[PDB]
Design a binder for this molecule. Sequence first.
Ligand SMILES: O=c1ccn([C@H]2C[C@H](O)[C@@H](COP(=O)(O)OP(=O)(O)OP(=O)(O)O)O2)c(=O)[nH]1
Ligand SMILES: O=c1ccn([C@H]2C[C@H](O)[C@@H](COP(=O)(O)OP(=O)(O)OP(=O)(O)O)O2)c(=O)[nH]1
Ligand SMILES: O=c1ccn([C@H]2C[C@H](O)[C@@H](COP(=O)(O)OP(=O)(O)OP(=O)(O)O)O2)c(=O)[nH]1
Ligand SMILES: [Mg+2]
Ligand SMILES: [Mg+2]
Ligand SMILES: [Mg+2]
Lengths: 193, 193, 193
Amino acid sequence: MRLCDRDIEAWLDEGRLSINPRPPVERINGATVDVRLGNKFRTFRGHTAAFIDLSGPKDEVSAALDRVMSDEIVLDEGEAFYLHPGELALAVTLESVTLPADLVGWLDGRSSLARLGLMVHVTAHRIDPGWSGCIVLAFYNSGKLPLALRPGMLIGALSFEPLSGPAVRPYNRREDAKYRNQQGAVASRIDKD
Amino acid sequence: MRLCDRDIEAWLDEGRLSINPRPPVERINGATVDVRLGNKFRTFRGHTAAFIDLSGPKDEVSAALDRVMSDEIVLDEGEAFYLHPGELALAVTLESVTLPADLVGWLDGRSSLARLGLMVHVTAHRIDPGWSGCIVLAFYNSGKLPLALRPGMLIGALSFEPLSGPAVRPYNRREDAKYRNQQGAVASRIDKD
Amino acid sequence: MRLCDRDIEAWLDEGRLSINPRPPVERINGATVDVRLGNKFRTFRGHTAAFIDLSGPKDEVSAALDRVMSDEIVLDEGEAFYLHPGELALAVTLESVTLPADLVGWLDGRSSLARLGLMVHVTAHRIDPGWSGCIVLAFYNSGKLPLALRPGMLIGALSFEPLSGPAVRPYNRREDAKYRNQQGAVASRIDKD
Ligand SMILES: O=c1ccn([C@H]2C[C@H](O)[C@@H](COP(=O)(O)OP(=O)(O)OP(=O)(O)O)O2)c(=O)[nH]1
Ligand SMILES: O=c1ccn([C@H]2C[C@H](O)[C@@H](COP(=O)(O)OP(=O)(O)OP(=O)(O)O)O2)c(=O)[nH]1
Ligand SMILES: O=c1ccn([C@H]2C[C@H](O)[C@@H](COP(=O)(O)OP(=O)(O)OP(=O)(O)O)O2)c(=O)[nH]1
Ligand SMILES: [Mg+2]
Ligand SMILES: [Mg+2]
Ligand SMILES: [Mg+2]
């Protein structure tokens, strides 16, 4: 049972859910709220490491991650990020979303973007109960043309599903949660596993 | 709450939900209905453009789109569409689906197709309340062999989720909705944002 | 509605669904249960075949699948599988999962993995009511570095959604179901279509 548009509004109105800035009525429809693209990005520098050991020693993994990740890119006014076919990049939503303990969120991309090969997540689109922050995007261009991405564009959509009850270990209370207070296009923290 | 198979049948009998043609009983099971491939495709002409500006002047965007999209391809008796590794293609379902204001639909592929690398959507699989039309597929072959696609093959599954109530701004009434009554392998209308 | 963590635990306590071995409390949180990578893999041998006719004669398809699919690869203690950019491979969860006729499961990857391009499914992530067995993973590396995967690592998450009622044709009782009693890194059985 996803929340319909009307019930998304009522949750935002009660304060059970928060999205900041609040998208206007025109971006709240059916069962979704549209989200927008941020201005923070990150790319990869492959020439600095051979591989990433997903479950290796924490120090080695951490060092490899630091070598391979670019600095955070902040786009000048009227500047685009050019996402080329075959390229994975990180970005972020404009909006910060905060979920209560009794709700879960789901990121979709967009059919218009899908038909040009742009994936807005890499089999990870769950926004957990207790989540609070902007949402980091893993972009991949599976199409044949480079896509110019500009801050402010409509980039995806969120839906919302009540849980069977309130989560007992929501994300804000989980001591081994990686992504609380998530600022900008944060890189993988797989080394904290 | 997804509609189970016997409730999918009930909703179809009752007529607010429509799938046309209606899959037989052997194709409605668990919490899904199987869907089949149509006969309309499009491909991409990359040599005609440097990039697509996904937030550019509506005129320039609309023109770049028109250069890069192939004419709609319609397949002869016994023809295959050969989907090569690394290529994005557009196709269409056989079936047309109609959802009322109080239902959302979700498109899956198939595990049998997944194990050969066939993706059937590009992070965009929500079928909205109020949707009426055949579903456009953005295919991507992530695998190691070309896959021959033939009209009428089983291509994916739809499941259906009641909303918390009837959407106030369903897809069929939304004046900025891009794809109402969609009737072939329709290219991106990202230029209408 | 998804089951919250506390309810997931209840359903496990009561034998309502099964996950074997049972993940500990630190892996059940919010609306999910974390799952782990098994030790069986398959790759592809593209040189043995020109293509796969998904919808062709059953005979010929089966022969092609048998030529292209590798023998099952079984990794030792501590051993790694190197998943390189642009390569699909098959693998399997550590956990076996059994769902009743009134529940559907859903498979997510992990944000930490998404941010390095690891897809854990290829648009096929539904676990059906009536399912019983380990889950075959279709892995694709959309990123810029190779990724070492070790048996036992955290690979993804499961969420569980009650259906509108019991499925009348759950997976365990459906005649043309392909994947009952599976079986390690089982290849595509699309030839059974
Ligand atoms: O694989 C898909 C997924 C969705 N749709 C349809 C169903 C849906 O109801 C509609 C809108 O999808 P979305 O909202 O993801 O696309 P958009 O580019 O944002 O279009 P709009 O601007 O109309 O919202 O397009 C498809 O045809 N194929
Ligand atoms: O990543 C996944 C996703 C699903 N499955 C299992 C669970 C599910 O219940 C079953 C069938 O899924 P699906 O119907 O998508 O596969 P199919 O190719 O259509 O097979 P069938 O003919 O048995 O329906 O396979 C996996 O092993 N791995
Ligand atoms: O596209 C996404 C998807 C999720 N998240 C956030 C929301 C979510 O609540 C959290 C964790 O998601 P996941 O559990 O998939 O990540 P993990 O790698 O398993 O992190 P953790 O160890 O903190 O659970 O990260 C994003 O920022 N972007
Ligand atoms: Mg939309
Ligand atoms: Mg199936
Ligand atoms: Mg997690």
